[PDB]
Amino acid sequence: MTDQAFVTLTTNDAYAKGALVLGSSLKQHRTSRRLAVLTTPQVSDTMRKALEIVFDEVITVDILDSGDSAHLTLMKRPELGVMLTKLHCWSLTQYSKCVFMDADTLVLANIDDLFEREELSAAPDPGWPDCFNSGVFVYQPSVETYNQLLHVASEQGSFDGGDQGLLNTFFNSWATTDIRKHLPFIYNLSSISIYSYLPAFKAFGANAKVVHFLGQTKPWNYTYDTKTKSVRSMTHPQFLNVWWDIFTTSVVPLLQQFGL
Amino acid sequence: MTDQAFVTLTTNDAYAKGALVLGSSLKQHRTSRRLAVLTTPQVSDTMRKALEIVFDEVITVDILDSGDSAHLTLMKRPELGVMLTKLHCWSLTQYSKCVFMDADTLVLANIDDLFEREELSAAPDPGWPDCFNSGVFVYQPSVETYNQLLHVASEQGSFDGGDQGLLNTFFNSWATTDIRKHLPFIYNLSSISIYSYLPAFKAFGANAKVVHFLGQTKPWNYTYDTKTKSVRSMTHPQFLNVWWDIFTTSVVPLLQQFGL
Ligand SMILES: [Cl-]
Numbered sequence: 398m399t400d401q402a403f404v405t406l407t408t409n410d411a412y413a414k415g416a417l418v419l420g421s422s423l424k425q426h427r428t429s430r431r432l433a434v435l436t437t438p439q440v441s442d443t444m445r446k447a448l449e450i451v452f453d454e455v456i457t458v459d460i461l462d463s464g465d466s467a468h469l470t471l472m473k474r475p476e477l478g479v480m481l482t483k484l485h486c487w488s489l490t491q492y493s494k495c496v497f498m499d500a501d502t503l504v505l506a507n508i509d510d511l512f513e514r515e516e517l518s519a520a521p522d523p524g525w526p527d528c529f530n531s532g533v534f535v536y537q538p539s540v541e542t543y544n545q546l547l548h549v550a551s552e553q554g555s556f557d558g559g560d561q562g563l564l565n566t567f568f569n570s571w572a573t574t575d576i577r578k579h580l581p582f583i584y585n586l587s588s589i590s591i592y593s594y595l596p597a598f599k600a601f602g603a604n605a606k607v608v609h610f611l612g613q614t615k616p617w618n619y620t621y622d623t624k625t626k627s628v629r630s631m632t633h634p635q636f637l638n639v640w641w642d643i644f645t646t647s648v649v650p651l652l653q654q655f656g657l
Numbered sequence: 658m659t660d661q662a663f664v665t666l667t668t669n670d671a672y673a674k675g676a677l678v679l680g681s682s683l684k685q686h687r688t689s690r691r692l693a694v695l696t697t698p699q700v701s702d703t704m705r706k707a708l709e710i711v712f713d714e715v716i717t718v719d720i721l722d723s724g725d726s727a728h729l730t731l732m733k734r735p736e737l738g739v740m741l742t743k744l745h746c747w748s749l750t751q752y753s754k755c756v757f758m759d760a761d762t763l764v765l766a767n768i769d770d771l772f773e774r775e776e777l778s779a780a781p782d783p784g785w786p787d788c789f790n791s792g793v794f795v796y797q798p799s800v801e802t803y804n805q806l807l808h809v810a811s812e813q814g815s816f817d818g819g820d821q822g823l824l825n826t827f828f829n830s831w832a833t834t835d836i837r838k839h840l841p842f843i844y845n846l847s848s849i850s851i852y853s854y855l856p857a858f859k860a861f862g863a864n865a866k867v868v869h870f871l872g873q874t875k876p877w878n879y880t881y882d883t884k885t886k887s888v889r890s891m892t893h894p895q896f897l898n899v900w901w902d903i904f905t906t907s908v909v910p911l912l913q914q915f916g917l
């Protein structure tokens with residue numbers, strides 16, 4: 398548990414807000430694991446300093462630098478920058494097992510039981526459910542795996558322009574092999590699904606442990622009324638409201654005195 | 658194989674067209690199994706006669722009749738009519754194992770290997786992928802199972818108003834148990850997904866064995882140009898076009914001389 402971690406990634410300040418809320422939500426639900434965040438030089442110094450408070454480890458990744466293992470793949474396929482940066486999660490060999498969570502996820506309950514899982518365990522992606530959604534996955538840091546992923550990234554790219562395509566291509570037995578590597582959908586609950594199959598959300602949505610904010614508007618792009626504790630208009634804003642409650646209650650106060 | 662069957666359901670003439678195309682597509686791809694269709698008295702006599710040509714067995718279900726086992730459940734929950742009728746698929750104990758396919762599915766390749774599967778095997782539903790989509794499932798006829806399903810239908814209804822909710826509730830270990838009961842998504846490929854995750858469709862859609870026509874427009878509600886062999890406008894109408902090719906080529910000619 399001391400050598401296990403939740404790992405996220407922020408490549409900018411907007412997603413840094415995501416990561417800060419995510420990390421705060423993990424602390425709120427009393428994870429016994431470490432919290433690590435991949436950051437890039439495009440993340441501002443104050444966001445980085447905030448990340449240093451919320452996270453146990455802030456790891457700077459600069460894929461634009463020739464010294465980075467992924468740099469040559471980035472030059473070949475520059476559009477794969479976010480993915481290549483994310484793949485550095487496999488470089489974190491100080492950890493024996495990690496749960497990667499995208500900075501646009503939100504933890505609603507302790508999910509430390511994810512560390513019982515093996516690489517690669519991920520929840521099904523809605524839309525194409527024989528692919529896993531790469532917003533939340535259990536993996537084992539390994540330079541070997543990292544190199545292998547980089548190699549596939551270089552050779553093939555990713556069928557969807559992101560880490561999800563590449564991770565599915567690499568971890569391609571997921572759909573047909575080992576039900577235990579199917580994380581329950583509630584560990585990576587697509588915010589889109591919270592209305593795409595509304596009866597199912599009503600039936601099973603109360604069990605949500607992780608909400609994954611997808612769609613063209615991320616939580617930080619909403620307006621939140623701190624008096625009514627509600628985002629301003631999707632009659633299930635409960636999750637957005639949790640995100641904003643954490644952001645306004647825990648995250649902003651953390652940054653709010655940086656001017657000092 | 659002689660006691661195994663594909664089973665579909667038509668509760669009206671529009672879906673009877675679906676069933677006829679479905680059954681024709683199964684014959685086209687050379688199933689060695691029987692073809693059975695549940696029909697209702699709301700299906701016209703000529704549609705029924707067409708079904709008698711395409712299918713090996715046409716089974717009439719009249720849930721509006723007090724003599725039907727499901728009738729009392731129908732009176733209790735009248736909106737569950739389609740589902741209750743569908744559940745009669747479990748009454749077909751002349752078969753040892755069946756693949757149920759909704760009348761809005763379309764077979765693109767032989768799928769007889771589905772009969773290797775056990776009850777309940779179904780593909781994940783996009784949208785809520787810890788539920789299976791009940792458009793295509795492998796099941797074993799059993800009066801006992803039928804009665805148990807009716808009982809749950811009576812007691813609880815269905816969380817989504819259809820067979821899918823009830824079947825998921827009953828076969829609730831699907832998401833967490835036995836990867837072999839996850840049919841590959843290509844055995845029940847949502848027509849909606851054919852654009853909801855477009856990169857995935859491009860990556861894996863060529864493997865489609867069954868297309869499931871979802872959305873507010875069923876294939877028979879489209880206009881098909883027989884000269885250009887294309888439905889008239891979703892830049893993947895290929896599947897609609899297959900459906901219409903079968904309908905215009907095999908199904909309509911079958912009915913076209915009924916006036917005689
Ligand atoms: Cl398994």
